Structure 1
Amino acid sequence: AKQSMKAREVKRVALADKYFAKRAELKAIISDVNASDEDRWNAVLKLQTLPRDSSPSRQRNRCRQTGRPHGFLRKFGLSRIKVREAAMRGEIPGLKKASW
C-alpha cells in the first residue's frame, strides 16, 4: 500500500505504546464495580480526551514486506503471496508443502 499508510501504522503503534499505562488505569477505574460514580464519570471523560490512535484496537496488522491490509498471518507476519515466495525459497524454517 501507500507509504503514507505504512507511516500511519508506525505512528499508531508509537502512540499505542506511549499511552498504554494511562489507558489501562483509566479503563480499570471506569469498569471498577466498587468505585465512586463521580470518579467513574471523570475517568470516562479523561478516556475520551485521550488520543484516538492510542487505542490498541485502531491498528491493523499489515504485511511486514509489502503492507497488504488483507491476508495477514501472525505466525510469520506476512501476507499469503510473500509467505508462499519465502516458503519456496526455503527462508521460512520448517515450512514445507504437506499432504495427508
Structure 2
Amino acid sequence: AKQSMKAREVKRVALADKYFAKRAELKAIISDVNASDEDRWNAVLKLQTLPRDSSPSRQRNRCRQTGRPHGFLRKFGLSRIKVREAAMRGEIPGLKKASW
C-alpha cells in the first residue's frame, strides 16, 4: 500500500503503548461499582483528553511485507498471496498441502 498508511500504523502503535498504563488506570476507575459518581465524572472527562490514536482498536492488521489490509492470517503475519508464495518454496517450517 502507500507509505503513508505504514507511517500511520507505526505512529498508532507508538501512541498506544505509550499511553497503555494511564488508559488502564482510568478505565479501571470508571469500571468500578463502589466509587463516587463525582470521581466517575472526572474520570470520564479525563479519558477524552488523550489522543484518539492511543486506542488499540484504532490499529488494523496488515501484511508485514506488502501492507495489504485484507486477507490477513494471525499465525504467520502475512496475507494469502504471500503465505502461498513463501509456503511453496519451503520457507515455512512444517507446512504442506493437505489431503484427507
TM-score normalized by the length of structure 1: 0.98
Q: How many residues matched?
A: 100
CA displacement at 1:35 relative to structure 2: 1.3
Cα deviation digits, residues 8-28 of structure 1 (max 9, x gap): 000000000000000000100
User: CA RMSD for the aligned pairs?
Assistant: 0.6
Cα deviation digits, residues 57-77 of structure 1 (max 9, x gap): 110010001000011111000
Where does structure 1 lack aligned partners over 5 or more consecutive residues? none
Q: Which structure is higher in strand share?
A: 2
Cα deviation digits, residues 37-64 of structure 1 (max 9, x gap): 1111111111111110000011001000
Where does structure 2 lack aligned partners over 5 or more consecutive residues? none
TM-score normalized by the length of structure 2: 0.98
Does 1:4 pair with 2:11? no
Q: Sequence identity of aligned pairs in percent?
A: 100
CA displacement at 1:87 relative to structure 2: 0.4
Distance 2:98 2:35 in 1: 55
Distance 2:35 2:85 in 1: 54
Q: Find runs of 4+ consecutive structure 1 residues off by over 3 angstroms.
A: none
